[PDB]
């Protein structure tokens, strides 16, 4: 069995590298922004024996700014470097945002009569939709167990992008879209709330001032899903949550009381979000109630008939 596994493992690693190399070669040959003279040179060195991950990264993936394949390379190489990983995530998000904005612009010109730039093939997804498509494609290929998904660093960055680029209600997007994304991808509920707590305590920009209203809304949505999950898992077994989650919702209520007060005394006139915040207060209290009941004994009596 040992000799079998060692060969199955060598073939699995070399197959992972080979697919990366094939994805690169195909993309480079098809890229409009690559001169023909270079493409023939790329085809010579990549359509043959499998190359090392260093070369694939330095000589090709990094030169062409294929940041998604850079991340797959950091995964195949067991690359321990959080800072470079996050730099690559930041470049991939920004590159995709600019590409989505460009395609929506070209569209708006068609729907208005103008002419596109020469050699531009004529309702493309909003930028936050194309961005999260990129995150999904990588996650399914790396399985979320990778070091290219440090949720403690990657979730705040994605939330930062949503704020600093208005990927919120103004354009008709769900303001909780970053949370939906990572939950559906299979991030455990406890880890989400744990990170969101750290976002709220440290107050790193842009998560500052009255925009912590949005952080509280994410916490509300995450805890809500967590409660639903626990209730579902209890019914499941008929046929972890600590007091820290309750404390976190209390502080969240205090943040909302602070934001509303500051909003009422702003220069130029009171803030327009008065009832929007009053609603969030009710939701947060409802969640603290549910969490308090579960913590107080209703969680050990979930498999029992009522």
């Amino acid at each position: 069995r040992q000799q079998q596994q060692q060969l199955n493992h060598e073939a699995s690693e070399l197959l992972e590298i080979a697919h990366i190399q094939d994805d690169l070669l195909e993309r480079l040959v098809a890229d409009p922004r690559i001169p023909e003279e270079r493409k023939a040179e790329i085809e010579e060195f990549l359509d043959g024996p499998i190359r090392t991950l260093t070369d694939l990264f330095n000589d090709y993936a990094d030169q062409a700014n294929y940041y998604d394949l850079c991340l797959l390379i950091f995964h195949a190489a067991d690359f321990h470097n959080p800072r470079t990983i996050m730099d690559t995530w930041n470049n991939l998000i920004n590159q995709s945002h600019f590409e989505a904005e460009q395609r929506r612009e070209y569209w708006e010109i068609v729907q208005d009569l103008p002419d596109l730039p020469i050699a531009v093939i004529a309702e493309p997804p909003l930028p936050y939709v194309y961005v999260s498509q990129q995150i999904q494609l990588i996650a399914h290929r790396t399985s979320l167990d990778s070091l290219i998904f440090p949720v403690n660093s990657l979730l705040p960055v994605v939330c930062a992008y949503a704020i600093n680029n208005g990927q919120d209600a103004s354009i008709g997007a769900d303001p909780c879209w970053p949370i939906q994304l990572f939950l559906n991808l299979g991030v455990p509920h406890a880890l989400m709330v744990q990170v969101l707590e750290n976002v709220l305590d440290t107050q790193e920009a842009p998560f500052t001032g009255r925009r912590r209203k949005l952080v509280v809304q994410w916490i509300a949505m995450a805890v809500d899903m967590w409660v639903r999950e626990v209730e579902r898992r209890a019914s499941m077994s008929e046929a972890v949550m600590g007091s820290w989650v309750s404390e976190l919702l209390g502080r969240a209520d205090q943040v909302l009381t602070q934001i509303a007060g500051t909003g009422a005394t702003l220069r130029g006139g009171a803030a327009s979000d008065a009832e929007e915040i009053a609603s969030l207060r009710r939701t947060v209290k409802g969640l603290k109630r549910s969490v308090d009941m579960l913590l107080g004994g209703e969680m050990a009596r979930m498999s029992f008939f009522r």
């Binding site: 270079r38 040179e41 991950l53 260093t54 990264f57 330095n58 000589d59 030169q63």
Partner: peptide, 17 residues
């Protein structure tokens, strides 16, 4: 085994020779 070396590469956007 990966080793990044931004120093000396080959200009991916320039022909050879």
């Amino acid at each position: 085994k990966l080793v990044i070396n931004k120093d000396m590469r080959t200009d991916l956007f320039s022909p050879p020779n």
